[PDB]
């Protein structure tokens, strides 16, 4: 159920690795920067129940299953 995931960015302090049910590659235009993030998703009994995010202007999220699946995937804005 749990994979190893690449960890880059805010949620990863200050580790390169991560453990979750899904790995993600994230992107958002923040403060004139195209900030990128990689890490984990894990289902709890409430809150965010989906790794996948409904698309919004300025943001894009792409999720995957498998060990280090997020390594060769990067979220690209449409």
């Amino acid at each position: 159920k749990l994979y190893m995931c690449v960890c880059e960015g805010l949620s990863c302090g200050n580790e390169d690795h991560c453990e979750g049910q899904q790995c993600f590659s994230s992107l958002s235009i923040n403060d004139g920067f195209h900030v990128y993030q990689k890490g984990c998703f894990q289902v709890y009994e409430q809150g965010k129940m989906t790794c996948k995010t409904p698309p919004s202007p300025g943001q894009a999220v792409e999720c995957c299953q498998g060990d280090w699946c997020n390594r060769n995937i990067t979220a690209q804005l449409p």
Partner: antibody
Amino acid sequence: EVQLVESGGGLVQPGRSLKLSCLASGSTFSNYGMKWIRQAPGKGLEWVASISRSSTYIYYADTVKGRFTISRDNARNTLYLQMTSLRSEDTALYYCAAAISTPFYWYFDFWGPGTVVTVSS
Amino acid sequence: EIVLTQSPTTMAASPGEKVTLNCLASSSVSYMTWYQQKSGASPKLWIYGTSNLASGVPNRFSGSGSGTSYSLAISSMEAEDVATYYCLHLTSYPPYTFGAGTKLELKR
């Protein structure tokens, strides 16, 4: 749309400190993120440091991390690079550049003439 | 960390000749940025996104690619095209890495 000019460069000694400055045309300065890219003589381009529009996000290169500090002043339209514990391989021409952000892409643009930093005894 | 390999290191082309400069990445990347640098001059933005020319850049220039393999192209080699061309990676968490560069010369 924006002009950038670098300064503060010169001869410096190993293990010592120096502060580079990048003065903008403005006042569009506070509309873009800012970057430092260095070029060693006879060699390629190496990204050094990044700072977002309001100093929210800061990034460094690994060879530079801990030693250098990137600063910003939107009121004075100036970008800074505090350099400490300077090494022989830090000897380079130092460009400052603005990050241009579109909803599809981002890139570096409007690179200045650069400033020469030399680290030797 | 992404590593960009540019090919060839140097090439010399006759006026009018078609040119392709390659930029290979160690992993898959979203898009590729290209810069032209002339001697004693700063690098200018040449191609952003993957295939988008900067303003002032001739239509003679072209960009293409996907995943790891990316290329800059010239439909007709000219004298003003003499420079070193660098590809830059931008589409991840730092560092933002440049390739070694391809020095382009004009056969005369």
